[PDB]
Amino acid sequence: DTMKVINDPIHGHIELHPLLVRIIDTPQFQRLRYIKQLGGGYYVFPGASHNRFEHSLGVGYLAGCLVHALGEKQPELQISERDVLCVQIAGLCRNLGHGPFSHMFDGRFIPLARPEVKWTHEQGSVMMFEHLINSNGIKPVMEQYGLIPEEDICFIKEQIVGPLDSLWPYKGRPENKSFLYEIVSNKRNGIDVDKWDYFARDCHHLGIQNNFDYKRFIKFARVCEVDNELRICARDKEVGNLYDMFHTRNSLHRRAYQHKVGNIIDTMITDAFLKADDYIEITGAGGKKYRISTAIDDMEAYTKLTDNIFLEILYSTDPKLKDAREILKQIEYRNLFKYVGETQPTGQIKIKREDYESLPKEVASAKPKVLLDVKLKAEDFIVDVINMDYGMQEKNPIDHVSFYCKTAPNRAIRITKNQVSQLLPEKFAEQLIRVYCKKVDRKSLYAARQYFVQWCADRNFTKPQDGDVIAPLITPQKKEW
Amino acid sequence: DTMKVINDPIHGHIELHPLLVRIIDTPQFQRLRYIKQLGGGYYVFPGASHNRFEHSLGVGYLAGCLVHALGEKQPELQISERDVLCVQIAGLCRNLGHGPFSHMFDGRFIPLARPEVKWTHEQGSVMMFEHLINSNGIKPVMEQYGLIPEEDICFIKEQIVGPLLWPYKGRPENKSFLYEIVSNKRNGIDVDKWDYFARDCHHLGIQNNFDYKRFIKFARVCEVDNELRICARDKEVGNLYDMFHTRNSLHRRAYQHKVGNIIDTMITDAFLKADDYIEITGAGGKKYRISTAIDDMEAYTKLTDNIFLEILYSTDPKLKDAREILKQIEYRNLFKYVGETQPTGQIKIKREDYESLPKEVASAKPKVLLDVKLKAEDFIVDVINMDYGMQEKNPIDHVSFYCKTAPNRAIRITKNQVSQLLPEKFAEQLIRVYCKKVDRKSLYAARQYFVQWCADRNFTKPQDGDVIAPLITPQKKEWN
Amino acid sequence: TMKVINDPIHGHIELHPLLVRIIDTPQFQRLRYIKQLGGGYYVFPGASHNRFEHSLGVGYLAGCLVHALGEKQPELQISERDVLCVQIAGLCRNLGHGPFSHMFDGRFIPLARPEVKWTHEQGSVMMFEHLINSNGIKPVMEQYGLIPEEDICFIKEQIVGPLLWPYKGRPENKSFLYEIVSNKRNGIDVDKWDYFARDCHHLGIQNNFDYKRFIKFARVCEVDNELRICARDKEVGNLYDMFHTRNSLHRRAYQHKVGNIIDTMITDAFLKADDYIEITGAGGKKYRISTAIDDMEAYTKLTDNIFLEILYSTDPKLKDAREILKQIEYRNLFKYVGETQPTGQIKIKREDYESLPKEVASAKPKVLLDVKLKAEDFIVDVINMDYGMQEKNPIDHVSFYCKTAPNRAIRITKNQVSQLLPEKFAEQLIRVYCKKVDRKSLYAARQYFVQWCADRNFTKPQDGDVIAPLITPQKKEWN
Amino acid sequence: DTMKVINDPIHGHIELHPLLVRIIDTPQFQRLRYIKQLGGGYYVFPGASHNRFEHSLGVGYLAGCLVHALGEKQPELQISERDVLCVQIAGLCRNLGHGPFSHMFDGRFIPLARPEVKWTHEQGSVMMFEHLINSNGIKPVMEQYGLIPEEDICFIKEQIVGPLESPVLWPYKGRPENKSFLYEIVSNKRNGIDVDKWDYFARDCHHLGIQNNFDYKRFIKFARVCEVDNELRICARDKEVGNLYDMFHTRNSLHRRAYQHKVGNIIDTMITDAFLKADDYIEITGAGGKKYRISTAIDDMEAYTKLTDNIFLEILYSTDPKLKDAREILKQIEYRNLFKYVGETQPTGQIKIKREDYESLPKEVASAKPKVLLDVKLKAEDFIVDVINMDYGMQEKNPIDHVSFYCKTAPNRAIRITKNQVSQLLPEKFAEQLIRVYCKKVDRKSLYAARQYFVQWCADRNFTKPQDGDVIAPLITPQKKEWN
Ligand SMILES: Nc1ccn([C@H]2C[C@H](O)[C@@H](COP(=O)(O)OP(=O)(O)OP(=O)(O)O)O2)c(=O)n1
Ligand SMILES: Nc1ccn([C@H]2C[C@H](O)[C@@H](COP(=O)(O)OP(=O)(O)OP(=O)(O)O)O2)c(=O)n1
Ligand SMILES: Nc1ccn([C@H]2C[C@H](O)[C@@H](COP(=O)(O)OP(=O)(O)OP(=O)(O)O)O2)c(=O)n1
Ligand SMILES: Nc1ccn([C@H]2C[C@H](O)[C@@H](COP(=O)(O)OP(=O)(O)OP(=O)(O)O)O2)c(=O)n1
Ligand SMILES: [Mg+2]
Ligand SMILES: [Mg+2]
Ligand SMILES: [Mg+2]
Ligand SMILES: [Mg+2]
Known part of the structure; x- marks a missing residue:
């Protein structure tokens, strides 16, 4: 196993460590090729054909860039190759929990189908990650590259979902490495590499010339002591750019992610899924059958739950699926x-x-x-x-x-x-x-x-x-x- | 029905005439949203997630741009609004015949599954177009905008597939140049290439060196051996050699990437092993196979990249061998x-x-x-x-x-x-x-x-x- | 005939032969030697662009918008004459800029001639008049169907505003034409649209505002007995974003703290050189940097070149001015x-x-x-x-x-x-x-x-x- | 003091080591702000307003990227920080010798004004570099960052101009054969594949409004050093051979479309003509107050420092009757006659x-x-x-x-x-x-x-x-x- 190079239109040629390649070449990760980043947004912006897969690669790459930059400028932080790989893996894997048409699934469908349950794609990502690791014998491979699965798996999950009262609530790494928890999914203020990738990638596809200059931010980032934690700090000069980053985010929500028609298409797809939920069967662990709404309870079933459900309903001939199919057909005729x-x-x-x-x-x-x-x-x-x-x-x-x-x-x-x-x-x-x-x-x-x-x-x-x-x-x- | 504006990342905001909107908002056209432009190329170039749908919009737009430019500079050509709409429709509809994973389907799968048959996506496009028109009552709508369905449907099909002595019936020799816009049978210089150069480059992460806007500005119609043809300014000859060089580069780097091709081959293998067991319902409830869906457009309408996932997620023991090949792709074996x-x-x-x-x-x-x-x-x-x-x-x-x-x-x-x-x-x-x-x-x-x-x-x-x-x-x- | 020009922002642009005639004059070609962003080039090394290429873009966009309105609304009776007059105003609204653009009228002139009230807009009208008269453009205008008396007035009004319905170049039913090049009512005009895209391309910042989108949704409607340009309601968010973008670009680039101090140091050098530099104007009369604004023939020759003339001087009288510029070169x-x-x-x-x-x-x-x-x-x-x-x-x-x-x-x-x-x-x-x-x-x-x-x-x-x-x-x- | 970050539209935010910043902030380097990369090309392509200055920063940056990449992948090469800085400096400084309107000056003007002389911008760069170093007290600053001025100045000059002596055998003195690959980065005398081209492809395309087909980041990822006939040389991965043929095709395209545009060339020719007619009357002050001509400023670096595109405007705005003929040619350019x-x-x-x-x-x-x-x-x-x-x-x-x-x-x-x-x-x-x-x-x-x-x-x-x-x-x- 050696490093692979991948050509991404946003980041150019990026290098992937063989451990990352092993995680990527699994059914649980490759699944993300069949989930649209913007869900129903593709039905309004025809350039938005991109899927969660390529976004995840970008997040993993940017997470590596930032952690490497900090380690190079500040050797006294003692960032290890182990730390770098754990951060990249969290970056790669934070989108694993997304369902069909991304935010449609957990923002609309699940709340209506299973009102009693409390489900988020973040929780889904942790569960999927665990299932990915166990199903594919990744723990031994991790050990082979110097990772300590007990601690590091915990660290990876914490980076995605937060702490699984206290000054320091995390177990995967100590307070002197606090800054590592701010890279992938920043619970303190939301400034993280996930946004940086999607700003650039969504803009490239949507036909909007906006983004945050993340390369700039990486050059000015430092780790400093804040209230007995070592945190990432931005250069004072950059404060205006950060306000602009949140403005850009809000612009993108207004223009694209909450487009009134993109939302109603998501709503119509959700309606079709609700009417199909009794009839579509998804096989999970041990041959047990699940529904669209219960596949979230079995990761082996959830692995097979993608945008494909849309077409399975649309191309069905079963009279039971007639009502669900009719709604989707209205979408095709733009009624x-x-x-x-x-x-x-x-x-x-x-x-x-x-x-x-x-x-x-x-x-x-x-x-x-x-x-x-x-x-x-x-x-x-x-x-x-x-x-x-x-x-x-x-x-x-x-x-x-x-x-x-x-x-x-x-x-x-x-x-x-x-x-x-x-x-x-x-x-x-x-x-x-x-x-x-x-x-x-x-x-x-x-x-x-x-x-x-x-x-x-x-x-x-x-x-x-x-x-x-x-x-x-x-x-x-x-x-x- | 009014004009719609659509935001395309390559061309910006494009205006679509209501007749075009009517053609687009059909199952036969929307189908193209589920067919990857570069087929297995997406498994090598992760930015290449684009589908045939958005390429088709771009071809339709560029076809309109060129025919408008010619009409504006040379009113003596007598280009009508009817001509413009017919050229745009041919542009929109020339990719309708593509099958699952585009060139995989007609370049690999069909030749192996039905060696006796002679099938191209072009023929498929004409058949799909006919089915789209008839199934959706488009002929009356065409009439409403000043088209003459008999001659214009023929013109559209001829623009895509060539002739079904001046061999064409949809337009006479003085409008010969209109046949050079969408699929140029004489020299291959057409708006289809211009869109895919720019779109594929944008998605692949490669830079395109052909400038179609430039070419449009310098294009004229002139008499050549008793036909009116599109002529390029002499100065542009270098840029045309460069256009073909770029095409060849893109084939070398991306479209014929050795791994992209072997993934297409593995998918083809899986389809061959699934062909006896997958059923696609066509006209009158008749069942077709992946390899015979090309004989019924109602069935072909439902034949997209979804076949891949239907196989991958199947539990039927009969599909076990096909499913195993696709699983080898996911593990990168x-x-x-x-x-x-x-x-x-x-x-x-x-x-x-x-x-x-x-x-x-x-x-x-x-x-x-x-x-x-x-x-x-x-x-x-x-x-x-x-x-x-x-x-x-x-x-x-x-x-x-x-x-x-x-x-x-x-x-x-x-x-x-x-x-x-x-x-x-x-x-x-x-x-x-x-x-x-x-x-x-x-x-x-x-x-x-x-x-x-x-x-x-x-x-x-x-x-x-x-x-x-x-x-x-x-x-x-x-x-x- | 029409010339085609390749612009990196707009692609291949067609220029009507009358516009080409206006461009191929010393008064317009002068803009090749004036940096768009002044001292900003000393901070953002991509910002090498000059006023010349920005002017071409403004002229082009002005043509795009007026053509779009005429095509969608034939009942407005927009003539080819109107189109050319709007394009010319677009081309010529930057003619009045001085050395390092906003440095000259924002810092130098106020300090050198505190009594005077000078703007680049006023300069543009004066330069335009001088361009027309010096180069025999009026006959050429007539040859393409323009009526110089009215149309020259219309062009100047588009740049500087009125020299009741206060305008003489066009009547109230063509009010919407005054909103294209320099929009006095709300600042939404094609000048901004070009500079957003051009500045972003050169600065290395991603340029928001989609002007093509705006053009597709623009209409003329009656507002309080004027025909005005109206935007589609849904575009209101994009307009707030346009002003946010403008303010960002000022914060990041145009008012960069070092760019500004370099402009200040150059202004200081110009003040110390003002008694000694001589610029020949009409009839051989000599002017100073600060008085060249009173004679267009002198002003024609007043560009960023003044910087290098001072820097490379050997005259002891220019020693103090030259020293300040040398501090810029050493980055002191x-x-x-x-x-x-x-x-x-x-x-x-x-x-x-x-x-x-x-x-x-x-x-x-x-x-x-x-x-x-x-x-x-x-x-x-x-x-x-x-x-x-x-x-x-x-x-x-x-x-x-x-x-x-x-x-x-x-x-x-x-x-x-x-x-x-x-x-x-x-x-x-x-x-x-x-x-x-x-x-x-x-x-x-x-x-x-x-x-x-x-x-x-x-x-x-x-x-x-x-x-x-x-x-x-x-x-x-x-x- | 510390690293500076500069925002370049081609490469993004680039870090510059404080030694490089010191070299940049001199009259000899800042001069490149007043020399158009494409000379008379700006008079045809209005986006081509860029100057040699920003190109030089990009060449210096790319040279650093390649030498760092080789060192990271192959520690056994023993690439030092000293090697990296020397390569970056050569990259920064290889355009120092350009004259007014770049290739116009050494391609047209000098051959006509001084037919006997053999002048290239490369030779000019070495002379300018020496003058930059000596005039600004850079040698001590070099020593402060671990460079050894005697051997490293020689290495830098050799990277730009090739061997400074006849060897007739390893002809270079700045570094030994085991570091031969370092001589292939900035100005590659063996095959022309170097970081100078990579910057100008991307920069010229950005400004001209043409799209560039060569991917240098890709090339850097696949570059290795291998032994070739007892030298250590940079080698490309086999499957990159098609991309290299494409790189030369792109170069030839850019020359056809832009650098040898028939009008761009005739404007360069007209400017050269004006310079020839002005050459007896324009004075440029060099060392010790001595006066030089446009055609002799190449003999004194202090004079050459002040020889930029400004000459064009000095002629155009002159009132001296002696400059009337030169001035008339430039006025024909303004009127597009x-x-x-x-x-x-x-x-x-x-x-x-x-x-x-x-x-x-x-x-x-x-x-x-x-x-x-x-x-x-x-x-x-x-x-x-x-x-x-x-x-x-x-x-x-x-x-x-x-x-x-x-x-x-x-x-x-x-x-x-x-x-x-x-x-x-x-x-x-x-x-x-x-x-x-x-x-x-x-x-x-x-x-x-x-x-x-x-x-x-x-x-x-x-x-x-x-x-x-x-x-x-x-x-x-x-x-x-x-x-x-
Ligand atoms: N001329 C090329 C060839 C490939 N790619 C892209 C496609 C991939 O995202 C990435 C890696 O493809 P390679 O063909 O370099 O790598 P392989 O893995 O196919 O070759 P090998 O395994 O022989 O190194 O680069 C590219 O941009 N330009
Ligand atoms: N602020 C916006 C809004 C939309 N779009 C894109 C998405 C579509 O591809 C195209 C048209 O969308 P609109 O929202 O302008 O049009 P609608 O049909 O949704 O609205 P309406 O029918 O009310 O005009 O523009 C965009 O780039 N920026
Ligand atoms: N192969 C080319 C040639 C030129 N241009 C650019 C440079 C100019 O800005 C614009 C027009 O240049 P032309 O060479 O087309 O125009 P000329 O005036 O030189 O040609 P002619 O007068 O023969 O039409 O296009 C380009 O992009 N690609
Ligand atoms: N919001 C900003 C500010 C600056 N720049 C660019 C301009 C310069 O090319 C480069 C460095 O500018 P800085 O303002 O970061 O650097 P200074 O030296 O001005 O700041 P300081 O010395 O205070 O760090 O980045 C940018 O792209 N965006
Ligand atoms: Mg490989
Ligand atoms: Mg609508
Ligand atoms: Mg010409
Ligand atoms: Mg600073």
């Missing part, structure tokens, strides 16, 4: 559920997850006072609530970043928002509410618009942008508008 | 590359002889001590034709040019008027040999047979010949 | 001390800029200092950052249309878009530098600077606790 | 035009007797004849015959690969000449006449038929059966 509009709660108002189901009922209960041919019911409405933030709810992630200055490179400091600019956001979280109608004819749509705008007025939400055009009889009643 | 050579002789190895080659390699008698003896079935011999798109012919001899001082007068430019640094030949064959036995001793043996076979046949010395077979290469003084 | 630059901002209400006025080095030197930091610094040792640079319209939100001055009613213009407020947007649209940055570069001077400069920030109630410099640990504790507001 | 391109041809078969004959060519063109009615008669002085040598960097030789390869199964064993083992679609020849003819008389009747003379001359000499020959000279081309 989609119709977007009605968008609004936001005002100021500090927030809607909660428990209430999401009551919203279609509220919209249908509005009493516009316009002449309507058709009356709509709760089941005709879809109400999608989207949380937009800087990765930490209402918190400013830059308040959780440590910096150093050129005159004192070993001394960590904090920089507040007011020390940077007044042109920055005054809030770091908000909600968008999108309403769609499942009845697509002209009269239903007209009615849906009247209900929607009336509902906005009753709730004191913001005036939809086209409110005066879509509901000219409703908007005058609200003088605030 | 691939058939092993042995080497590459070329004929020195000017006769091309013929397609009819391809099957006899593994036998010849196994019949070589290398004078070397060997632990293991290999059989014909252990060898794969892949013959690859590399050319400038027209066998031995120089495609630039079939291009017409014009000069700045006389923009309507077509001229010819010969190779000697351009450069002495150009190719003296325009076609060649590469022969790759692989071994299905992957252990160290089998591979060592395979190398000895291979080099011996090269020597016996008077093929070129493999590049690593002296390293892989030091006992064999001395016997050939032509190599020393 | 004035040293950056830090940055701060005013707090709460406070805004620093232009009239007070000169008093600021005095104030910094007057601070009494309670720390032991080896050296005492004087006002002349400090440079204080005040930078106004905004979204192009002072305290105003430029998106409040944009008109939108919806898909369901394409001819009905609407307004969209900030609250209808996002709560993650800026609450303010203007601010000031204050950078302090020290002309004394040794270790002890620098240490002292830092103590003064932080003390001054404290006394004035400015924001705590980012590295305040590190550079002045004895000073920052005294301020509870800072912790 | 350029000498007119007449056409292009090539010698046939074996014919090779010699440098000594270049001056006789305008006479030959004017001596042609086209059998056509002409209103104007043209003289030798009305014609410019530009002869351009196009090749793969080594005259008639295939540079890939001078490359060593290794195979995956035996990484330490160097091998040769011949053209026939690669492809039949490759060039059969590796050198050729283009002949461009221009007319200084730009009116319609002169141009018509020039075309008739030119095509007649092609016919008389048996050169190739110009591409538009039948269009520009329909009465002349029929007389040549070889063309019909």
